[PDB]
Write a protein that binds this DNA or RNA. Sequence first.
RNA 1: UGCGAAAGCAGUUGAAGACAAGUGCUUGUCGUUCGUUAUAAAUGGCCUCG
Lengths: 362, 129, 121, 59, 149, 16
Amino acid sequence: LLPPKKLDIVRLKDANASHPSHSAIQSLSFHPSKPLLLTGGYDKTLRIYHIDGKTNHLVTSLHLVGSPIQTCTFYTSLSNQNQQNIFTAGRRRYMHSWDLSLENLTHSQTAKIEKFSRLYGHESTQRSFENFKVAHLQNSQTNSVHGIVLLQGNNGWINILHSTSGLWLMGCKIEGVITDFCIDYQPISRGKFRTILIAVNAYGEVWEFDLNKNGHVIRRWKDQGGVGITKIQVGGGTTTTCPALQISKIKQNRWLAVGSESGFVNLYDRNTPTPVAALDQLTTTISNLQFSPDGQILCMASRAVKDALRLVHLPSCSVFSNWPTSGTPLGKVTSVAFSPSGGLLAVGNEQGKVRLWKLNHY
Amino acid sequence: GLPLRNYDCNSGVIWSISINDSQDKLSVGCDNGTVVLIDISGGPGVLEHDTILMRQEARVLTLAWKKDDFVIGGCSDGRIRIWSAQKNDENMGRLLHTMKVDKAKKESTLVWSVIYLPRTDQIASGDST
Amino acid sequence: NPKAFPLADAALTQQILDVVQQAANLRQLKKGANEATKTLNRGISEFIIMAADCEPIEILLHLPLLCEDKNVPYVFVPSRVALGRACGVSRPVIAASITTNDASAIKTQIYAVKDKIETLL
Amino acid sequence: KTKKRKTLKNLRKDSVKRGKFRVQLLSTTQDSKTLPPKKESSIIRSKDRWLNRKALNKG
Amino acid sequence: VLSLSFSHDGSYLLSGGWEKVMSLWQLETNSQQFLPRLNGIIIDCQVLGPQGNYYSLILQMTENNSNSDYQFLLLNASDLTSKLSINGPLPVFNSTIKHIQQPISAMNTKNSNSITSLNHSKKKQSRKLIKSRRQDFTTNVEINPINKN
Amino acid sequence: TDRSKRRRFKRKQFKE
RNA sequence: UGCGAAAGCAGUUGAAGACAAGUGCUUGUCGUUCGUUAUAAAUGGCCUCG
């Protein structure tokens, strides 16, 4: 267990010194197993960097003309470990995928790229693919597992598409404007787990859908004292930042954090709910909420002002004091990423800088 | 074949009328978005007022009930609304929830009909779209 | 909280908690019970918002009596911590008042909210 | 003939303005009791136009 | 309708027929998406993949009544684009050959056979190939001097 | 008040 | 259907079996056969990527 108030960190070289980015860094992603980083932005380029902490050379670059990058993520099939995919999107009515399986990543001369652009009659509900997340869905009736791509609708709509074929499976709706959503996995038995979609409205009502049962609502509750909610995240188990490799590795998240425009971060224990703590160390809208892979550290960052990044120890809910400092260079934080292992924190800014740190405790 | 009793709802002009499960109370939807509950258990020709549910700015085009406890109403603002009709409940008349239907972009959206499904505890709604 | 009446409902509170937010941005929000009392006496309030979850609730119960005297609409919201957050502060706000300004850039929806409160009353 | 028609409207007219006054005729009690009251039109005419909207193309 | 096939999960139904259009019927809502414009009417249709990544389709090109012209299309299900189109040479003979029969349609036409018309047409074709003496079965073909195509 | 009647009147009318 | 030009010149469209309907009899049919060169009509129309 890491210390409550003292955090032992050392800075390393920046990632993009090998190849700088010409625009802001809209998102970051760690490869689940390989030591690789994904960066994307309005430069329209998916620059991937081999992270080692002493060189961080660029492996390959892929420019996508006319596709400003708002988010990007690695994907590995939960069953077929050989399968590797990258999904990226922007303010567009289509989504790109890139297969990294076999020799595509490094050796192959050309990149196998495909475009998702078909919603199968639900085109009205969706205007852009920019906000999306990838999760694992278990078909209980057949016991097969496959990926799902989740999207944000125009009016409280959540469109769920098939990861590879791109088929539309089911749709979830909430009242009011959908702001953010997050995914939690609940194991049932050996080889069996259910996926739960958590969605939150600006007011603070939180919907819980059972995607294994046609996305039916299973629980409804409100964030206490929540207004102007901006982001939602879960921690303490499997998730996008900390994906699983096999079925047995599936684990439920014990932490749930709610952002707001006011700069408060409300924290809940997943084990109307009453919050454990109401973090207040940021005074601008919460633009990033992310946990450490083990769920022992929560990072909140805001893009409104410079150096607006804090780390919370859990379950103490006490913000670390030694860091960040005034001399710590963070700038306008716009992206945050935790390594699945090795306790490495990566932070991007508007200047095109990915700067790297090591959690000495891990 | 003559009007036995003429009763004024005492509200905006009526769009819809519905009767409860116990057949003792009538719910009446108005142009002014007021839903008036009229008691009729007194006897034939005896119509009496029970309660007024809160006032909202959309018309009430349709009404149906869930047993004797809740009143579901489709509104001209493209929204479905549940009112609590329970006696002995602090949430009496209380608009527990609001649903919004998908709205035609260039056109006003109207919830013309709503019906309750006891077996599945579901509400089925028909809209102008 | 029986006496808090009328109490805005789940849909309504957003339109209430929405308008207060911009009013704070535009400096058209008087926040805290004592400021609300000032605005009624000077009659510079469109309407007043109170929080029902207050303890002990009566503290704001003087404001309504002043309200109908001046024919100013008023409404209750369920949560006070929600209100202060909407006001734009780090402390729960029990009562807030919107300042009268016909030249404001947020002018329309305030009166749209005012009408809904009037219907609620 | 048009004079005859205008004569009907005067008979139909149930209220007239006298100086600052307008006096209103009082209908019989039976007319109210035998039949239900007249429909208000603005409430009903709205439904009919909606059912006969152009975009529908009732044609 | 000539080809019907269920998806692996059963949530989608693939249909194809004389319309030259493949239809994805979305069964939770009975919505439908269309991949029209295909070269031939759809004799067969299938989902081919562990995860339904590709569709395999069989096209007929009924315009050539002399011969049955089969074309096999493998489509990427993600974007419904031709991953692989396969066919042989497609000569148009003057008359029908061996046991080529037109596909079934709602009514008997020049390019199709009705329900009753199938047996009579088959017998007539066999007896034409046996008793009749005009057996040209000759096709025009051309060769390109510059490219030899 | 006079305007608010118009706003209420305009809002209730169906928009075609 | 044969021949021929594209115009046209000649020649065909039978029999058995089974089923259904109506009333042993009548009519209509055939993913039945033998022989001759031999109207339709279940409201049901074509994707998206500026």
